[PDB]
C-alpha cells in the first residue's frame, strides 16, 4: 500500500465503527509507532501488509518493515512541536518547551500537552522537522493533567 513519508492514523474496526487507537510515522519505508497502540500486531495499508520488525514493551516502541530509523534527539534547550493527530480531528502543530523526567538511568525530555489516548504515537519535532520522539507514554500528575515522555528509539 502507501509507503509515502508522513504521519498516519492507526485505526481498528473491531469495536463500534472505525476507532482511532493511535498514530505513527512512516520514514525510509519503515512505519514507527508505540507498542501499546498495536500490541505488535500486523497492519494493513490499502491491500498491502506491514509486518512487525522490531519491538520492545519497556521502551513502548515498535517498527514495521525494517529497523527503527528515527535518531534525532531533543537538544535540551530549544522549543519543540507536537504534531498532534487526535481522533476524528485534523493534524495540528503545537509548540511547547519540554520539561524533564529525572530517572535513575538519566534524564529524558517531557511534553506537558493534553490529548485523547488515541493520539498516542503522534511525533514530536525539532526546528528542522526531524522526529525527536513519540508522544503517548508518561504519567498523570496531581492536577489530573498528563505529562508524556519524549520517547525515542535507537538507530543501529
Amino acid at each position: 500500500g502507501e509507503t509515502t513519508d508522513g504521519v498516519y492514523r492507526v485505526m481498528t474496526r473491531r469495536l463500534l465503527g472505525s476507532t482511532q487507537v493511535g498514530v505513527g510515522v512512516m520514514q525510509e519505508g519503515v512505519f514507527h509507532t508505540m507498542w501499546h497502540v498495536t500490541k505488535g500486531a500486523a497492519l494493513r495499508s490499502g491491500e498491502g501488509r506491514l509486518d512487525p520488525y522490531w519491538g520492545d514493551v519497556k521502551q513502548d516502541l515498535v517498527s514495521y518493515c525494517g529497523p527503527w530509523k528515527l535518531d534525532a534527539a531533543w537538544d535540551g534547550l530549544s522549543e519543540v512541536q507536537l504534531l498532534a493527530v487526535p481522533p476524528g480531528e485534523r493534524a495540528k502543530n503545537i509548540q511547547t518547551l519540554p520539561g524533564i523526567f529525572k530517572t535513575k538511568d538519566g534524564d529524558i525530555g517531557a511534553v506537558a500537552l493534553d490529548y485523547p489516548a488515541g493520539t498516542s504515537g503522534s511525533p514530536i519535532l525539532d526546528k528542522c522537522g526531524r522526529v525527536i520522539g513519540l508522544y503517548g507514554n508518561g504519567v498523570v500528575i496531581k492536577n489530573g493533567s498528563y505529562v508524556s515522555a519524549i520517547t525515542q528509539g535507537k538507530r543501529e
Binding site: 500500500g1 485505526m11 474496526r13 495540528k92 503545537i94 511547547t96
Partner: protein, 39 residues
Amino acid sequence: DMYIERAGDITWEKDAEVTGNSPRLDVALDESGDFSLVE
C-alpha cells in the same frame, strides 16, 4: 484487524499555537514500560 491512513506531512510550522509548561519530575520506569512518579 488494524489499518493505517495518511494524516499529513512531518514539518515544523512557523507561527504555530504555543502552549504547555515544562515540569521537572522524579520518575521511575518499570519492566512493563509504565512510568510512575517517585515521591
